[PDB]
Amino acid sequence: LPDLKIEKLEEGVFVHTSFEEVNGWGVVTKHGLVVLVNTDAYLIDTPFTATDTEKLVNWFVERGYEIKGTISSHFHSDSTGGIEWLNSQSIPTYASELTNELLKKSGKVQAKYSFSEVSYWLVKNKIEVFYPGPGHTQDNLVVWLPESKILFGGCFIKPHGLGNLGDANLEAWPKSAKILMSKYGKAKLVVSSHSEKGDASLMKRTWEQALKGLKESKK
Ligand SMILES: C[C@@H](O)[C@@H](C(=O)O)[C@H]1CC(SCCNC=N)=C(C(=O)O)N1
Ligand SMILES: [Zn+2]
Ligand SMILES: [Zn+2]
């Protein structure tokens, strides 16, 4: 499978794309972000593997950046697979307390730092972490970049098919989608884990898909 790809979105915002075969889903394409604050870099989700996480870190280190911190949007491996490697390099990893306990219960390595707040400033006025409510998972988070007006929706944004429902809360997802739409209507760009980037309407598409999946789940 190809190496991690890095693509600039605009000044200070990069998309990282990694590929992994996962048991019954075939090769998964996963998008995360790298956000620059001056000469500091922040990883928004880890790629699937230690190897891709190392390639990503080394790419920004070679371009003169310090990796100040990572945030995992939820406990699944497409958001957290790099945490063990980052910890071994003493790069600060962050997850919600709920995410870290879901990781523990799954026998996975935890982020070194956790937080319980619904709205958490990873970097004050630069990187906000928000819990809209359950959807894709009980713990899923989004990341908001107030300066660029970019929203990273992770595996919660699902405009054309909900994907893995194993850990999903179909009852809550529509309500959580409305909360997200209410908070981030002013997003100029929505980046998701597995879909094409788009405008704020991807939040409304997610609301519609969640309702459609909830109606389906009731034979
Ligand atoms: C591999 C694991 O992280 C998994 C998950 O988080 O549930 C991946 C694989 C999947 S299915 C791949 C994409 N299919 C439809 N969007 C999803 C997802 O549904 O968000 N994420
Ligand atoms: Zn997931
Ligand atoms: Zn996913």
Author numbering: 4 to 222
From the paper:
The most solvent-exposed parts of the four antibiotics are very distinct, while in addition, imipenem has no pyrrolidine ring in the antibiotic tail. The terminal part of the imipenem tail was modeled in three different conformations (50%:25%:25% occupancy), highlighting the extreme flexibility of this moiety. Due to the different conformers, the interaction network is different in every modeled position: conformer A creates a hydrogen bond with the backbone carbonyl of Val30 and water-mediated hydrogen bonds with the backbone of Thr32. The most solvent-exposed conformation, conformer B, lacks interactions with surrounding residues, most likely interacting with a water network, while conformer C interacts with the wider water network. In addition, Trp28 shows interactions with the pyrroline methyl group (C-21), present in all the antibiotics studied other than imipenem. The lack of this interaction in imipenem could lead to a reduction in binding interactions to the loop and may contribute to the observed reduction in affinity (increase in Km) for imipenem. In contrast, imipenem lacks this additional methyl group, which reduces the strength of the lipophilic interaction with the Trp28 side chain, thus resulting in greater loop flexibility. Furthermore, as shown by both shorter and longer overall simulation times for all the complexes, the tail of imipenem shows high flexibility and occupies multiple rotamer positions; thus, it does not contribute further to the loop stability. In contrast, imipenem shows weaker binding (Km, ca. 50 μM), consistent with the higher L1 flexibility. Notably, the kcat for imipenem is 2 orders of magnitude higher than that for meropenem and ertapenem.
